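User: Assemble these into one structure.

Assistant: Restating your components, then the assembled model:
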Amino acid sequence: AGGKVTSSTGIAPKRYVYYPGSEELGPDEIRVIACGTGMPTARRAQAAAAWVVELGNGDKFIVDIGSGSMANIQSLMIPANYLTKIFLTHLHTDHWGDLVSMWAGGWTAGRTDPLEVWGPSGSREDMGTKYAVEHMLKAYNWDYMTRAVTINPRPGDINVHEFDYRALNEVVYQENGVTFRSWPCIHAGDGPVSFALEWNGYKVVFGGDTAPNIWYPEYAKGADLAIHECWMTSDQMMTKYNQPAQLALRINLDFHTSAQSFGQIMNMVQPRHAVAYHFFNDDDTRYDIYTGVRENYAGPLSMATDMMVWNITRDAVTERMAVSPDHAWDVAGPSEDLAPDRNRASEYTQYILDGRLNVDEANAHWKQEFMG
Amino acid sequence: AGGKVTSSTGIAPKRYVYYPGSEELGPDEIRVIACGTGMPTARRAQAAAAWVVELGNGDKFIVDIGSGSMANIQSLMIPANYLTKIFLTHLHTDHWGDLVSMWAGGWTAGRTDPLEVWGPSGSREDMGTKYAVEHMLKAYNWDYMTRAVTINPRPGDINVHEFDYRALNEVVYQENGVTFRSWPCIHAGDGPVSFALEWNGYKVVFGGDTAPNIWYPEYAKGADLAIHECWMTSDQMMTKYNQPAQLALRINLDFHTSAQSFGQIMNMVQPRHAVAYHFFNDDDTRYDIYTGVRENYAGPLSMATDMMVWNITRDAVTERMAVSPDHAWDVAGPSEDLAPDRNRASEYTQYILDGRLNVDEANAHWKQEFMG
Amino acid sequence: AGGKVTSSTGIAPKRYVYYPGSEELGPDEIRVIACGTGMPTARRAQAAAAWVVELGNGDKFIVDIGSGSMANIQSLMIPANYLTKIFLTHLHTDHWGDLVSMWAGGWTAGRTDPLEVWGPSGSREDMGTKYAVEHMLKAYNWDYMTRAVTINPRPGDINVHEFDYRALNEVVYQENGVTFRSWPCIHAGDGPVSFALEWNGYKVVFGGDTAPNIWYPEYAKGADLAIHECWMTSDQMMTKYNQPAQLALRINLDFHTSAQSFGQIMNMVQPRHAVAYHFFNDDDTRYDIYTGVRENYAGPLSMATDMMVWNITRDAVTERMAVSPDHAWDVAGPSEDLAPDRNRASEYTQYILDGRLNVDEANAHWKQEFMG
Amino acid sequence: AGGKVTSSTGIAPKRYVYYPGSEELGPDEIRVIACGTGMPTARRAQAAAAWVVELGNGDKFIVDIGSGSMANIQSLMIPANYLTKIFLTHLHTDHWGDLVSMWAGGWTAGRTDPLEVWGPSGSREDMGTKYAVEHMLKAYNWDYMTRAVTINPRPGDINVHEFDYRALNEVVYQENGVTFRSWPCIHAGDGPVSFALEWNGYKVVFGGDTAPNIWYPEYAKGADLAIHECWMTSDQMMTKYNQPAQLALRINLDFHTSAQSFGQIMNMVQPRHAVAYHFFNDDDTRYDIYTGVRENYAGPLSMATDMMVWNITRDAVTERMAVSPDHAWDVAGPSEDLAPDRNRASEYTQYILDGRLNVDEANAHWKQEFMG
Ligand SMILES: [Zn+2]
Ligand SMILES: [Zn+2]
Ligand SMILES: [Zn+2]
Ligand SMILES: [Zn+2]
Ligand SMILES: [Zn+2]
Ligand SMILES: [Zn+2]
Ligand SMILES: [Zn+2]
Ligand SMILES: [Zn+2]
């Protein structure tokens, strides 16, 4: 498996797994990594929805950042200043839960620009991304104010770009030859959308969560890589969540897209490669779901799980697994100093500061040796 | 290792590893489970700070619920109805970022009561826990309002019991034989605290985070299990983060509790069992840290890592590892069918519901089999 | 998922995963664990062929013991003395490579009786199991003679029971109500067999390796669990091993059991549950293999991987995953240590023993402590 | 951690973890990878002893290849043809058990030269390496003869280079500027040795198994990297193995090198870097072991676990962890395909070949698509 090794001290070429940080991206390539593929129920094996998209022009995007995903994203050895741009298909906790962790973690880890978030309005102010993000920041104001005492705060801001959820395949981002468009989904209530990213001839479709709708088939047409929700079977709804037969049946018809519906939709879309996700990918779930999709779609397919990666070039769409460090550490980028802000009041009172215990004796040993 | 196996078809007794869900609790026993031991920087091997405490009387508590920790908590096979009470030492994202995830995932998973959260206050309203949780609930307002359309809102509420962060060893909860007391910490700004849980003649202390202070050695005195921050060394600060010397030296004296200070602190407390946590536990960091500690403390000592477990009994404090499923699933409890509040208006508009794709034909085949 | 949890302090019942050591086996139940499911090529995710069978009368067998399987087998927390009987289907390294590690490690793990091994003859003496095992013992002469000086050597014998490979469904074992029959396979050269195991109404078939043959369909009919080889596709052969199309094609017609053949065979067998094994079980191989099998067979099917477990009952064959410890240990049994025979030659010379380093000093301190 | 990333589309330099196959080895550099560090008891976390050594001139060696190590070795993505040279410290199963798996597996994976094995003599013929490997090949004669029908048999040979175990730091290998030397150990009986590899001013010492002895401290002196056995504590011996107090005490005195002894030894040796191995490396064992060593040794130290890697250069010896695929595959090297031999009698008799099942019908669908 992999490319043929040509030399003893050389590098293994065309490696059968993706090792994050070890492969150059070419000018006419896209790399998409599934950093979370699962549910609102947590599990170590699948974080919640998150995709990282790296373009050969050097731009990098996050689409969705669900609870748990930060640990996958941080294992990619991408410096935090390259991952400042985040798109949210909707405001379920399992699609934006780890935004806080990107915001706060990315900032101790040396981001120097503000985060930029694109996401959808709702049917009124208090159901859209602008309201959501603004209150999150208040939610974590203790965290914000104490951190800002010691680190310039400009990177701790979040610039939100709220776009109209109702719009039909309209542009919501356009920069440096890259376009994002959105269109709506039908999912729990008004707000959710799907994105399409266009760049240098490629189209990548990030479906989000949805019951089957008429817009995705139209606007995802011809994607190089098309991602869509694909639910666990009604038989698995009974075994796993002990649901009555009637409610089990409805889930795969009213509330969610079934594997059979996914098959029809990808049959319509005709992409170079489809990707089913948002189901628990276990040894006793995955096969029936595959078979349901194959009822109606015959083309290249990926059954998504965490750390799956696609390389999109002219000639091919290649699925591999990424093998990344469990004991991850932040990795530094080329960015430099921002001089801390002198105009920040301490959030300590003298009362607390008087509580300090004397520990000079116990530390004098290591403290002495270290000062060489 | 473990108890002598005596039967061919029986059950291995007193197992060398803890299998969650497999052992009964007994009326004089406490079980403490580290569900996160890490840093604000995320990592598959270490979720951020979380602790689960199950008591002999059937009571359960989460102390801290940092980002990523839910996946570990979920692998315990404890029904969502039994973990409704959560205690926060401080408002840093790595000590309550997964609250939203408990709140949202638990509610979907049939939790029937509201979550209950105790946390400190700050030097003013916008720096304390009641303000944080209030704005957290607004942050996830879309999620709340849409889920509340098909599920009774009562489990979606969160009752916040704020307490004065300045109080010295005062009682903050008192129920069913169980007491918690708080005292202050010295950590980034006013607000952060430690807890001591007292029950049935047991005392268990949760340090949260702090620089060494005079309050912990006093009020933690003779704990069965005492938990305190223990930071990485200054040589490791220079190697892992590329800190210059002066700054690395100070991280361990002014901002954080060094291993040498932790030992001193535990030499004072004289507990049954001491736990160091809040450092990246790796094959190249851990040993120098345990050796800084032993300089000043020689009692029993745990170097915590995720899914480590302590059994408190009269005879001993026993450390084991937990071996849980990575492919976790929610596990049902006793609690009943609490019905939808049918007055709740839908959150869809007709403009969205109007885009449903027709998928009758595609689903006809499996619809028919499942019905018959 | 799993069974309804009924008390805070008690035990979760009918658990969705099998924790080895934590469940009783009932007088009318079979438990089959896959301890290896892989190939002649090694891999942490899949050891080579090995099967553990625990019967409700308290009998235990290993059918095959391929290279790498001991780590999985030793995670079952089964005492070494319960695992003395071993059936080999054939003599490829991936089916008996770990015999020696059972022999040696098991002996130090406690085993007190001889290992006992059943396996087939070949077309001449030097192609059979007696020759094989006897020469393996000579290969490890040094380890055996040196270990025997210190102990009674009885547990280091291996008694081999060779049976004719040509025989059609004849009994090779019959003890305590358990029967085993064998019949032939077509696989590399004369000698490999498949086993049927019968006890208390149940029938479990261990197919081993084989190109498709007339004996399996006949003698495997009506098995509770039928295990058979099921190969990787010809596309995957060209993709992963760079086979030119012609050779890739015949790999699936001449030499191995194709997925479609597997389906045809299990079609004729009509087991309660069929098991496919012996392929690399990766996110990018298993779907085309499953689909191959479903062309021709629609009864219950398992796609094996390591640590899969089947519980067999009158009412059901249930598939679970086992969750067992990676940091496994020797677990002590009832078996009691027997008296040696003061009559074996030492294997040291004095030239060697006169090289001992004087370490008295460096060991004095911890010595002093330990004599408490 | 790691080098600073300089570009969006570029490769992370000096990565904080080692991804096998991804790094060029410099002309004046050695890379040593621990592919097993455990015991004769099997465990997923710790294969039995195995070291892979890669030199900057393109030469590679395996020192020990114990049970279970092959899965780790195979994850390194080195073509079988580059790892034909194997050095055995001694003839315990946990040091050469997986030799049969290198032999068979690498042959079916396009190794085209014979394996070359160096190992010690014993006090008489039947306690040496030559005898041992001769009988290992006979033990697996069914596998050997059936394979040589279809694959050229040359690479199925093992040339054994036996050397005198008694020799005191004498060359046993010399080639292309690379020297291995051996000296005796005291372990179980006469035969075991330790090795030193010398090349290009570097010295790496592979301890093997031994009670403390006068030879290692003298001949390992000034090693760039030195490896020695470091046994579990006597207390851990009573907890984990239930050894009575006196038995547990002599184990660390007469039979093994205690951690305190390790430390004295390394204090004499003064290696640029020391490495302890051959203990179960667990959260509840490692710490006291490390404390043991530091009683007497203060220099750089690693506590070996599986997939740890050392880079040795002129400036530094760096420890890192290797992160490699669990789902491993053979990778092909540059070599010339070896044509078989037709003068090889089949190992099939017609009696078995007459048993083939016809499967043209079940296979006709996929057959047709695949041929076009
Ligand atoms: Zn959603
Ligand atoms: Zn979702
Ligand atoms: Zn904090
Ligand atoms: Zn913290
Ligand atoms: Zn075979
Ligand atoms: Zn095989
Ligand atoms: Zn040995
Ligand atoms: Zn050994």
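Chain A touches chain C at residues 1, 16, 239-241, 282-284, 286-287, 290-291, 294, 301-303, 305, 308, 319, 321 (CB under 8 Å).
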